Amino acid sequence: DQLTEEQIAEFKEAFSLFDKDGDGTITTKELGTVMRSLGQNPTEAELQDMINEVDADGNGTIDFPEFLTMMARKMKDTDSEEEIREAFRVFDKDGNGYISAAELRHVMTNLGEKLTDEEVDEMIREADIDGDGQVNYEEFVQMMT
C-alpha cells in the first residue's frame, strides 16, 4: 500500500549486499560480483544496461534513493508470484522443494556474508512455520508476501 519502515530496512539490507565496499553506491563491478555469485552469468555489456536503466540521474552508479524507486515499483510487480519462485530455485540447490540450513549457508556465504551456525539456524527458524527444520516453498512464499 505504502512503503512501510521495516520494508525500507529490508531494502537497505538488499542494497548493502550489492554495495560491497559500503561507499553508498552500486557500480557495475559490484553488481557483476553479486550476480556471478548467484549463478547468473551476464556480460559487461548487459551489466552496463542494467545500471543505466535505473540510473535515473545519470552519473553511472546507483545510490539508495534510485534503488528504492525500483524496489518501490517491484512492490507492485504483476510477475511477482513467478519472481519469488525463481528466487526459491536459487536457494533450493538440490531441487527437492525445501531450503536446508546448509543451502542457506551456501548462498549467504556466496553473497559475502560471514555468519555463525546459530545466526543461520535463526534465519531458518524465522521462516520454518511447520517446525521440520527447513523452509519449503509455501513458507518462503508466505514470508515474502
Binding site: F11, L104, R125
Partner: peptide, 22 residues
C-alpha cells in the same frame, strides 16, 4: 541479530539478480 531482515534482504537481492536488476 535481525534474522528476518537478513533473510528477506538476501532473498530480495536474489530476486533482483534473477530478473536482471529489475
Amino acid at each position: 541479530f535481525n534474522a528476518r531482515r537478513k533473510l528477506k534482504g538476501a532473498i530480495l537481492t536474489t530476486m533482483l539478480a534473477t530478473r536482471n536488476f529489475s
